[PDB]
Structure 1
Amino acid sequence: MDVLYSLSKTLKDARDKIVEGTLYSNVSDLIQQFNQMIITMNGNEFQTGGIGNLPIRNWNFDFGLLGTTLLNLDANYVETARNTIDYFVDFVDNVCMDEMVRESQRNGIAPQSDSLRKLSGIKFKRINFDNSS
């Protein structure tokens, strides 16, 4: 749940802060967090949605890191970031929906969907950052 929230928060920050012409100093920490997220998620397969009419979605992560060398962000940087952000946002939305439609009488506080169960492993705990909501 903390890793899922951190993914969503990182993506929201990327959508709100990775904008054309912005100083790299405005995004440097965010770019580090985003690259950490990409590294952590790369090479992992996820499956979301086999309950009700929720479609089966398969997710593969093979993305390049964002650059750290610009002074102000330009169109190329924003386009690469936007493509990666779109894929990740779709993945996070599907994972959230898959988790929202499931319930358990025994351990209902624990994750129900297999995607969130996978995200609860130690290998994803690096993604975790600011939990302010």
Structure 2
Amino acid sequence: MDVLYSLSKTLKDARDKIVEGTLYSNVSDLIQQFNQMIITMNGNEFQTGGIGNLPIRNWNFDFGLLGTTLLNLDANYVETARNTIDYFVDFVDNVCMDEMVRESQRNGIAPQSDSLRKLSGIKFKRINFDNSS
């Protein structure tokens, strides 16, 4: 679960600190964290939806990392990034919603969805960070 959290603060602190004109070094510590993610992800496939009117969309990952040789970003840098973020956003939305509908009497304190159950897996823990929300 905590996993999930990160995924976002990652994107927020991303769609926020990554803009046309900021010095690289203001995101050095960040950039890293990001990439680290892409890696852990790529390869594994997911299923969301499959209930009521909720659509069953299939997500797959195949992305190239990010920059490393930059000094204050050039517009071009952003757009090639934003394009990658938007797939994760539209993703998480579907992930949240899918686990935001399932309920369980016995153990209704743990992950239900096929999507999240897979995240609590150990091979992902490598992402968690900045738990200030």
TM-score tier by shorter-chain length is over 0.9
Does structure 2 conserve the Cα–Cα contact (< 8 Å) formed by 1:98 and 1:113? Answer: yes
Alignment partners' CA distance in 2, 1:93 and 1:29: 26
Structure 2 residues without counterparts, runs of 5 or longer:
none
Q: CA deviation at 1:110?
A: 0.4
How far apart are 1:26 and its partner, in Å? 1.0
| Alpha-carbon offset, residue 44 of structure 1 | 1.1
Q: Secondary structure at the match of 1:119?
A: coil
State the shift of 1:127 in Å: 1.3
Deviation at 1:68, TM superposition (A): 1.4
Q: Does residue 61 in structure 1 map to residue 61 in structure 2?
A: yes
SS state at 1:8 partner: helix
Report Cα offsets for 1:55-108 as digits up to 9, x if no partner.
001010111101011011111210111011100111111100000011000111
Cα deviations across residues 11-64 of structure 1 (Å, max 9, x unaligned)?
A: 111100110111111111111011011111111101100011010010101111
The alignment's C-alpha RMSD in Å is: 0.8
Runs of 4+ in 1 over 4 A off after TM superposition: none
Within 5 Å, give how 1:1-133 maps onto structure 2: 1-133=1-133
Gaps of at least 5 residues in structure 1 are none
Distance 1:29 1:38 in 2: 16
Q: TM-score, normalised by structure 2?
A: 0.97
Number of positions where the alignment pairs a residue of Structure 1 with one of Structure 2: 133
Distance 1:15 1:35 in 2: 15
